[PDB]
Amino acid sequence: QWALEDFEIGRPLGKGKFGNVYLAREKQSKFILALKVLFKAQLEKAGVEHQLRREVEIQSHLRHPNILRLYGYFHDATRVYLILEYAPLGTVYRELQKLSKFDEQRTATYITELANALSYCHSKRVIHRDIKPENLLLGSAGELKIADFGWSTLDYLPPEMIEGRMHDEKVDLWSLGVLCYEFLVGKPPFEANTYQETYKRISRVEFTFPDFVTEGARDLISRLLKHNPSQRPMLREVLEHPWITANSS
Ligand SMILES: CCc1ccc(/N=C2\S/C(=C\c3ccnc(Nc4ccc(-c5nnn[nH]5)cc4)c3)C(=O)N2C)cc1
């Protein structure tokens, strides 16, 4: 179906580990989109051809406004290209750097938008690992969009994953706890100056709140960051959580 000659290439929109993403326009439709380039030799150097292949097959079937859409993909002699949804307003990480921290309305809105994306995924038996601000993009109306590779620094990993126990649907809820914290405070809850320490602090769920963090927020974050996965509240319970409904659009 596709080839590189079918597109005009624009400025870079981001740098991945295996290649860059560029703004691009499909020539006949004039459809604006994003295009991720991936080097094949570089892929085989780290042996992830069929880690990535299953990954692509998955998110083709995923359609949700709070998830970045994969329209299609193609290849050539040297590279592999992914056709992506263009997200005009950029990354949340960038927004959080400009603003230092987010207010409660913004935070609660993003959390709701995330929770809805994950509910959709879980309903289709798709689970997600750690979610970083770097991998959250913004659509044209300011809507949050999840963009990364999985889909089924430690700062975002839950205790069960770093301790080498059964990963599970409940990982997602840990991620919401960390993000909700980071949105309000401006840095993640178990940030340390060493990996060894960050590991240790995550395993103990050893973290504290700045004075300004309201008790509604404290409650939600404390409930999501429970060490026992099964004690973390359901996604429905998050969306219903008083502080969420009180602040979210
Ligand atoms: C199919 C799912 C998927 C595939 C590859 C992915 N990896 C990506 S995507 C990506 C960049 C990207 C994708 C879609 N839209 C944008 N929009 C955008 C970002 C920044 C700015 C900006 N302006 N000024 N400063 N920053 C403007 C627009 C960026 C990326 O970097 N990786 C690794 C993620 C998901």
Distance 239 CA to ligand 1 centre (A): 27
Query: Measuring CA to CA, which residue among 190, 187, 244, 248 is closest to residue 219?
Result: 244
Does 81 contact ligand 1 (Cβ within 6 A)?
A: no
Does 87 contact ligand 1 (Cβ within 6 A)?
A: yes
**Cβ(175)–Cβ(128) under 8 Å?**
yes
Q: What does DSSP say about strands 32-39 and 7-15: parallel, antiparallel, or unpaired?
A: unpaired
**Cβ(243)–Cβ(183) under 8 Å?**
no
To the nearest 10°, report the CA torsion of 217, 148, 136, 26: -160
Q: Of the listed 6, 76, 103, 130, which one is catalytic?
A: 130
Return the bridge partners of 32, or none: 25
Distance 244 CA to ligand 1 centre (A): 28
Question: Method of determination?
Answer: X-ray
What resolution does the deposited structure have, in angstroms? 2.9
Q: Which residue type does 41 have?
A: A
Q: What does DSSP say about strands 20-26 and 136-138: parallel, antiparallel, or unpaired?
A: unpaired
d(CA 240, CA 249): 13
Domains of the chain (ranges; CATH) run 1-90 (3.30.200.20), 91-247 (1.10.510.10)
| 130 has catalytic annotation | yes
d(CA 143, CA 113): 8
145 annotated ligand binder = no
d(CA 182, CA 187): 5
HEC readout, the chain: CCCHHHEEEEEEEEECCCCEEEEEEECCCCCEEEEEEEEHHHHHHCCCHHHHHHHHHHHHCCCCCCECCEEEEEECCCEEEEEECCCCCCEHHHHHHHHCCCCHHHHHHHHHHHHHHHHHHHHCCCCECCCCHHHEEECCCCCEEECCCCECCCCCCCHHHHCCCCCCCCHHHHHHHHHHHHHHHCCCCCCCCCHHHHHHHHHCCCCCCCCCCCHHHHHHHHHHCCCCHHHCCCHHHHHHCHHHHHHCC
d(CA 223, CA 203): 16
Query: Measuring CA to CA, which residue among 179, 58, 65 is closest to residue 126?
Result: 58
**Cβ(116)–Cβ(39) under 8 Å?**
no
Backbone φ and ψ for 240, nearest 5 degrees, come out as -85, -20
d(CA 17, CA 210): 34
d(CA 133, CA 153): 13
d(CA 166, CA 124): 20
What Å distances lie between residue 79 and 12, 19, 83, 93, 148, CA to CA?
A: 17, 10, 13, 28, 19
